[PDB]
């Protein structure tokens, strides 16, 4: 595929399938509210070495356990045969 | 104050050597740069801007006086009064208008009065060559 067409199709897919949810989650990511759960208290700042005798070693980012509350995404399957009917706004 | 409507061109009444510095009481003409009209005094609606055909030395001649007394100019902060040549009239504000006040307008019409006021002194500010 030509470069402009490739970029256009990628951007079209992102815009029509992922833009709204990404924007909402990006807005929600600013705050850090956390509940008191057994999983919450199990979080350790430093992951201990499996072999042992090793400390102060950072774990890989984005692989631990997160407990901050983030609302889940909502989507509606596309369908152009259902009967056409305040009314809630349509979903992605 | 930034628009082009307030641009006035000074032309000394001397036939040549107009580029020399102005003198107190020297007769001259004031022209509107954008419209091409010349300031003048007439008997029918006082002082107005007229065309070049009707512009004569009897009505279009004005002089810069140091003060209101009857009997060279620094470019800024000179307080040079304006007096019509061959007349004892001076440029001044038309007395405050209640109707103008009603419309809170700033159009303080200009009138040529034999005594004017004490605020008749004014400064001259040169505009850029671009304007």
């Amino acid at each position: 595929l030509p470069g402009p067409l490739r970029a256009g199709y990628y951007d079209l897919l992102i815009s029509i399938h992922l833009e709204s949810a990404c924007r909402s989650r990006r807005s929600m990511l600013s705050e850090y509210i956390v509940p008191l759960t057994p999983e919450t208290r199990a979080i350790t700042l430093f992951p201990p070495g499996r072999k042992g005798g090793n400390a102060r070693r950072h774990g890989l980012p984005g692989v631990g356990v997160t407990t901050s509350l983030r609302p889940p995404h909502h989507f509606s399957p596309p369908c152009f045969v259902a009967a056409l009917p305040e009314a809630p706004a349509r979903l992605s | 104050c930034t628009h082009a409507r307030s641009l006035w061109r000074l032309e000394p009444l001397r036939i040549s050597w107009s580029g020399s510095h102005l003198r107190w009481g020297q007769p001259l003409r004031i022209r509107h740069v954008t419209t091409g009209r010349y300031l003048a005094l007439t008997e029918d609606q006082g002082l107005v801007v007229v065309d070049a055909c009707k512009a004569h030395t009897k009505a279009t001649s004005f002089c810069f006086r140091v003060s209101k007394e009857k009997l060279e100019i620094k470019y800024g902060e000179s307080l040079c009064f304006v007096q019509h040549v061959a007349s004892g009239l001076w440029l001044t504000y038309a007395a405050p208008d209640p109707k103008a006040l009603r419309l809170g307008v700033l159009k303080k019409k200009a009138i040529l009065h034999q005594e004017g006021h004490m605020d008749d002194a004014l400064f001259l500010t040169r505009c850029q060559q671009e304007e």
């Binding site: 929600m28 600013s30 705050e31 850090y32 509940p35 980012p61 997160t66 | -």
Partner: protein, 513 residues
């Protein structure tokens, strides 16, 4: 993205350790309190310990417990050595994780070396890319500062309140999703529904600190600024109701909302004030019942509201003759709201603030047109004449009618509000006995504004007593049209505040009529 994930991991670990530490702290405090209560042989020392360590606000107590960072000041902390050692270990672990102390073993080193190498290799020409790399590099060097700035937005909640909280979050998101879209009917309806759902949630009033941290008041104020900068009055009413309720939730919310007082008062107008809850009501809620906020009031806001009062007192209100009511020449109902705001500002907790009262009376005497046709040097109508004229105006429908709004009652309501405002601006009795020059001057000015004869005469005016009239049908005086005793109450408050009771003869004369 990965840096944000690292910061989130750090804050989550901090919260988990906070819970773990606070459990042990509570247990230790319980044990020490039990020891203090059971063993009180050293009664003086026991009393001193109970006064200092206990019987104190929880924040001060926990600040005292955590004041052992330096060994010099560690003597004042009764915490055990093991607990202090545990906190020191956690602090050391946090410092090590933040990077406080070749192959870039860690992400921070890799990012820093990458940014430096990119900068050295070529002269970057894209401003966005340059800003991105420099911001990222600054985050790498200032991770501890980043955590410090991110801490205020951190919050901890109980597991039993998560569900509703999530719902609240969802609603908030919808409101945010409506910021980037131009205002319209559907967006207005969704905003109203989201605001109502925010109203009905229990978490909204259970955790006011959480709502302040999320900054929902700033969001709704931004939306109101957008809609005001009239079309869509319902949305403005909903925003004003939300702000008033938010102020009524807690005192810190009132302090936070007091900052926007200038804009709220500037945007307060007759047209905006005609329908529903108004920004003037928001300002009144932000200023009501708070003494230090009342003292913090600036004189420019009082000048602005006095100017609005004078303006509405000079000319009639456009919608009154738009409906078809006869022209009168001024706006009593418009000025009623300003008078109410002024008396709310002046009078707090049953007492009068002398500074605000003096400023208000100075502005009022500086602009006599605020007093309307009556109490006017050029006019000289008089209180009794004005009230009788209003009564006879309300008696006949030729001038009273054009009803939703009756001008005859409006005249009496406005004059009563003005009299009440002047009454509560009077100085305190203790200042009067103290002989303060300013208090005597203010009292003399108030006595010069209105006389006693008008007060007694207007109090002597009777009412419209509801008579039986027709059998089985009560002929009642329809309210908001006739003379109600509210005017009498406010202005006898004036009489007590300013003139008081001179002697027994005056008291008997007042009681007689």
């Amino acid at each position: 993205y990965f840096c944000d994930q690292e910061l989130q991991h750090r804050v989550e670990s901090l919260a988990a350790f906070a819970e773990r530490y606070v459990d042990k702290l509570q247990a230790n405090q319980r044990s020490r309190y039990a020891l203090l209560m059971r063993a009180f042989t050293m009664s003086a020392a026991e009393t001193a310990r109970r006064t200092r360590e206990f019987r104190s606000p929880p924040q001060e107590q926990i600040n005292m417990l955590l004041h052992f960072k330096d060994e010099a000041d560690e003597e004042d902390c009764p915490l055990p050595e093991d607990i202090r050692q545990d906190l020191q270990d956690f602090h050391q672990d946090l410092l090590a994780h933040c990077g406080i102390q070749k192959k870039p073993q860690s992400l921070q080193e890799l990012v820093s070396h990458m940014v430096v190498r990119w900068a050295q290799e070529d002269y970057v020409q894209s401003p966005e890319l340059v800003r991105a790399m420099f911001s990222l590099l600054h985050r790498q060097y200032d991770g501890l500062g980043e955590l410090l700035r991110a801490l205020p937005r951190a919050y901890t909640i109980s597991p039993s309140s998560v569900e509703d909280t999530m719902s609240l979050l969802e609603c908030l998101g919808q409101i945010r999703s409506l910021l980037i879209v131009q205002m319209g009917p559907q967006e207005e309806n969704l905003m109203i529904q989201s605001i109502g759902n925010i109203m009905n949630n229990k978490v909204f009033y259970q955790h006011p600190n959480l709502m302040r941290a999320l900054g929902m008041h700033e969001t709704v104020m931004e939306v109101m600024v957008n809609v005001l900068g009239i079309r869509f009055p319902k949305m403005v009413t909903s925003c004003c109701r939300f702000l008033c309720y938010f102020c009524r939730i807690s005192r810190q919310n009132q302090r936070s909302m007091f900052d926007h007082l200038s804009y709220l008062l500037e945007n307060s107008g007759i047209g905006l004030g005609m329908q529903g809850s108004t920004p003037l009501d928001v300002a009144a809620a932000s200023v009501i019942d708070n003494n230090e906020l009342a003292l913090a009031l600036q004189e420019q806001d009082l000048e602005k509201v006095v100017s609005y009062l004078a303006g509405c007192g000079l000319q009639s209100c456009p919608m009154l003759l738009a409906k078809g009511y006869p022209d009168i020449g001024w706006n009593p109902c418009g000025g009623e709201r300003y008078l109410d705001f002024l008396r709310f500002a002046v009078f707090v907790n049953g007492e009068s603030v002398e500074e605000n009262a003096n400023v208000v009376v100075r502005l009022l005497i500086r602009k006599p047109e605020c007093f309307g046709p009556a109490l006017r040097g050029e006019g000289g109508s008089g209180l009794l004449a004005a009230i009788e004229e209003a009564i006879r105006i309300s008696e006949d429908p030729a001038r009273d009618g054009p009803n939703r709004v009756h001008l005859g009652h409006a005249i009496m309501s406005f004059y009563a509000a003005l009299i009440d405002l002047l009454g509560r601006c009077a100085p305190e009795m203790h200042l009067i006995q103290a002989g303060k020059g300013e208090a005597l001057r203010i009292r003399a000015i108030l006595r010069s504004l209105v006389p006693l004869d008008d007060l007694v005469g207007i109090i002597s005016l009777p009412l419209q007593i509801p008579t039986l009239g027709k059998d089985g049908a009560l002929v009642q005086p329809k309210m908001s049209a006739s003379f109600v005793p509210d005017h009498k109450a406010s202005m006898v408050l004036f009489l007590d505040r300013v003139y008081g009771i001179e002697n027994q003869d005056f008291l008997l004369h007042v009681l007689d009529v």
